Write a protein that holds these residues in place. Structure first.
Motif, short mmCIF file in Angstrom:
data_model
loop_
_atom_site.label_atom_id
_atom_site.label_comp_id
_atom_site.label_asym_id
_atom_site.label_seq_id
_atom_site.Cartn_x
_atom_site.Cartn_y
_atom_site.Cartn_z
N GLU F 15 -1.73 12.08 2.31
CA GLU F 15 -2.88 11.82 3.17
C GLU F 15 -3.37 10.39 3.03
OE1 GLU F 15 -3.00 13.24 0.37
OE2 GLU F 15 -4.76 12.52 -0.72
N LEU F 16 -3.21 9.79 1.85
CA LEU F 16 -3.64 8.42 1.66
C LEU F 16 -2.78 7.46 2.48
CD1 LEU F 16 -4.40 8.67 -2.15
CD2 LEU F 16 -5.87 9.16 -0.17
N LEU F 17 -1.48 7.73 2.57
CA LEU F 17 -0.66 7.03 3.55
C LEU F 17 -1.11 7.36 4.97
CD1 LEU F 17 3.21 6.63 3.43
CD2 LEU F 17 2.09 7.24 5.56
N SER F 18 -1.49 8.61 5.21
CA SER F 18 -1.83 9.03 6.57
C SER F 18 -3.02 8.24 7.10
CB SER F 18 -2.13 10.53 6.59
OG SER F 18 -1.06 11.26 6.03
N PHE F 19 -4.00 7.94 6.24
CA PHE F 19 -5.13 7.12 6.67
C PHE F 19 -4.67 5.74 7.12
CE2 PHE F 19 -8.27 9.55 3.76
CZ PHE F 19 -8.21 10.62 4.63
N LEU F 20 -3.80 5.11 6.35
CA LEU F 20 -3.41 3.75 6.66
C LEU F 20 -2.34 3.75 7.76
CD1 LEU F 20 -4.67 3.43 3.70
CD2 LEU F 20 -3.26 1.37 3.61
N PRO F 21 -2.38 2.78 8.66
CA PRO F 21 -1.30 2.64 9.64
C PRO F 21 -0.02 2.16 8.98
CG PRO F 21 -2.79 0.80 9.82
CD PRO F 21 -3.41 1.74 8.83
N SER F 22 1.10 2.47 9.63
CA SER F 22 2.40 2.09 9.08
C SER F 22 2.57 0.58 9.03
CB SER F 22 3.52 2.73 9.90
OG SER F 22 3.50 2.25 11.24
N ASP F 23 2.12 -0.12 10.07
CA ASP F 23 2.36 -1.55 10.19
C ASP F 23 1.49 -2.38 9.26
OD1 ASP F 23 2.54 0.08 12.73
OD2 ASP F 23 3.81 -1.62 13.29
N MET F 88 13.21 3.60 6.04
CA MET F 88 12.70 3.69 4.69
C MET F 88 11.61 2.67 4.43
SD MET F 88 15.68 4.78 5.05
CE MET F 88 16.83 3.45 4.72
N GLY F 89 11.42 1.72 5.35
CA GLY F 89 10.44 0.68 5.13
C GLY F 89 9.05 1.23 4.90
N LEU F 90 8.67 2.27 5.65
CA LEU F 90 7.38 2.89 5.42
C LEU F 90 7.29 3.45 4.01
CD1 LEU F 90 4.64 4.22 6.18
CD2 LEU F 90 5.99 6.12 7.10
N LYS F 91 8.29 4.24 3.60
CA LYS F 91 8.24 4.89 2.29
C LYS F 91 8.31 3.88 1.16
CE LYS F 91 8.25 8.72 2.45
NZ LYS F 91 9.50 9.54 2.40
N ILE F 92 9.31 2.99 1.20
CA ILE F 92 9.51 2.06 0.10
C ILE F 92 8.37 1.05 0.05
CG2 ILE F 92 11.99 2.41 0.25
CD1 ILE F 92 12.32 -0.12 1.69
N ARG F 93 7.89 0.61 1.21
CA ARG F 93 6.75 -0.29 1.23
C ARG F 93 5.50 0.39 0.69
NH1 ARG F 93 8.33 -2.84 7.12
NH2 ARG F 93 9.83 -4.35 6.29
N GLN F 94 5.29 1.67 1.04
CA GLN F 94 4.18 2.41 0.47
C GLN F 94 4.26 2.41 -1.05
OE1 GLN F 94 4.38 5.76 -1.04
NE2 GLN F 94 2.18 5.71 -1.48
N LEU F 95 5.41 2.81 -1.59
CA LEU F 95 5.55 2.90 -3.04
C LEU F 95 5.34 1.54 -3.70
CD1 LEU F 95 5.85 4.77 -5.26
CD2 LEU F 95 8.32 4.86 -4.94
N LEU F 96 6.01 0.51 -3.19
CA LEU F 96 5.97 -0.80 -3.83
C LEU F 96 4.60 -1.44 -3.70
CD1 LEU F 96 9.47 -2.34 -3.08
CD2 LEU F 96 8.61 -1.20 -5.14
N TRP F 97 4.01 -1.39 -2.50
CA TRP F 97 2.69 -1.95 -2.31
C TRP F 97 1.66 -1.24 -3.17
CZ3 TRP F 97 -1.82 0.32 -0.96
CH2 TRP F 97 -2.89 -0.52 -0.65
N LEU F 114 -8.97 2.10 0.10
CA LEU F 114 -8.28 2.77 1.19
C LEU F 114 -9.20 3.74 1.92
CD1 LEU F 114 -7.34 5.95 0.28
CD2 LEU F 114 -5.91 4.60 -1.26
N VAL F 115 -10.14 4.38 1.21
CA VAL F 115 -11.06 5.26 1.92
C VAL F 115 -12.00 4.45 2.79
CG1 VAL F 115 -12.91 5.45 0.21
CG2 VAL F 115 -12.37 7.39 1.68
#
Lengths: 137, 137, 137, 137, 137, 137
Positions: F15-23, F88-97, F114-115
């Motif tokens: 859900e924390l990813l869900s709040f933030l846009p992918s880009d 994978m850019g969304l997933k790997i960028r999420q993890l790394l960022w 993020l909230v």
């Protein structure tokens, strides 16, 4: 002009080590890989903890300069590797194996292991136990 | 396949040996004769008296096996000795000279002797103090 | 613009060292090599330690930039370079020699040595000792 | 000859410059005037107020030497001058801006300021704060 | 780019485990099912507990992503897949086997078992016990 | 096979990813360079500094493996590569960022950041603050 015992200061003789068969000693590439993987930091450490580390240090430097000489010979040649690799291997394998093996295991258990191996191999194959080699501690 | 410094007992700075010109160090025959005549009894059935004794005995042993290789090459030729020493002698000289010199004199006096000689040679030739040889003690 | 004396915080003046003739200072290459081979670890240490250690760092950096300038000028080209070299030669020699010498010896004795040299050179050549005073200790 | 980290004692100038764009730094004459209008007398004091002070005054002396070289080159020329101005401009502006900025503000706030700037610039322009400038204190 | 050893913080090296032959490690499916059926609650626990528990989570996630990559490649298609599978097969087998085994047994005995296996395999096949040593306790 | 929450110990990534846009996440190479210019040596330390550190180094190893796979695929291809990069850019960028950002700043400030970003984005554009970027500390 002179000859000295590589192993006496550790308590072993050239006769004692040469008693083992030549074919038993493994290759050199895997031996170097093992030594490096185990003690990259230990051999390069600033402090000389034990004489074994120092001795293997000059040994590996000797092999490095020797393979450098082999490459220079190959570049300046005018079968060559065949006669020379064996005649150094029949020494370097023993040297490197002994120091790394005696580094663990206490450096004494190697002596009883090798003497038991010699007793085992001196026996004819008519009656012979199937499990000779080194144990694990 | 790897790069390791031959020295670590405060001599790891190979640049210190590089500062002194190659021609300064003596020939192989003189150093070998001096070492033999001065420590033939010392380097025979010793104990771990000092790591220097070890390092120098493996050094002389590896030089001996290089010379065995060279003699066998001469016996199995088909100039050969001329080009090999051009490198091997330079390596062995900076290898063993430090050990044999520092075996006496305390092993630290050689250090400031080295740095003082480097300073002396760095000074301009036009204004040069008359001499700066090695001082024994 | 307005210029600031570098040595004035240390306790000397530029014109005080200006008395030394050009030939007295050695080659820049030997000075740089000596400093590097003597204090590579200190220069590469994450600790500033003495302020002279700091100053030498930027001095080496700016001179390294100066060789970059010479290289760029030469690249654009395809006399002037010699004049540019000999311009900063005296200044970098003064700075490097002072810092290297004062790094050892305590940094005080350099002052008495240089003032004595000034006394020596101010004397007309007829009434001079056969040799100039040299640095001691 | 060698690659030396400028300020490893003060963070590490390489990657910290890498975060910031080259064009962020202001004009060199503006930096010189800003430092001058602040600390004409402070630099000329006969005391090592801070190692940072010694480094920055050595840097400004190097800048003056570079300007003297540029004046001589222009006077003795027989397009390149612009690339001379912008070539060292990155390096000299980095050094001078770093010294001027970190002289005040405590000399640690610059680190977090630049890391925040790196975070800001790494953010894509889809959503980005309008400004991430320096913060006074 | 630059690679980092994963096991080095644990106390092992990649090449240390590289000695094990491919056939020794079991099927990936059985390993995954075993780990899941043994520690589903631990993996799904909100507590990290052992760092190995953390590591297994991202390992499973990246492998699950790898099946997604294979599925996407297959979907785009309408040999290569087999080679891609067998590439990471050895690496994931090493990682998963190490973590699962070290999770029990204390994580130390694995080290002695693997070093003993290295001793066993370095020995030429002629002078080997009829069976290889197996993990105990 | 199974759906596993990436970091339930660290909040809940879904859900924390869900709040933030992918880009919102930056380019992957920028993230890699930013982490590298900071902590080349810290990761390679032979000690589990933090479970978070172990997770992020495992993640970067997985990234390197993915890049090796991409290089092999490009070398052995016989449009899709772009969707591989952005898939994978969304997933790997999420993890790394996430790892890079929460490594500093305490690792809890990211949650409120993020909230707050979610509150900001949920606000309609009729009245919206011009920027809600990351806050340094």
């Amino acid at each position: 002009y002179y000859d000295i015992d590589p192993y006496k200061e550790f308590g072993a003789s050239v006769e004692l080590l040469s008693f083992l068969p030549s074919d038993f000693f493994p290759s050199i590439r895997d031996l170097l890989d093992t030594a490096s993987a185990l003690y990259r930091e230990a051999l390069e450490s600033p402090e000389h903890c034990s004489p074994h580390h120092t001795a293997l240090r000059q040994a590996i430097l000797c092999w490095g300069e020797l393979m450098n000489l082999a490459t220079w010979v190959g570049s300046n040649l005018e079968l060559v590797v065949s006669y020379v690799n064996v005649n150094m291997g029949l020494k370097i394998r023993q040297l490197l194996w002994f120091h790394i093996s005696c580094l663990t295991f206490g450096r004494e258990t190697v002596l009883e292991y090798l003497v038991s191996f010699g007793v085992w191999i001196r026996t004819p194959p008519a009656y012979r136990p199937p499990n000779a080699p080194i144990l694990s501690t």
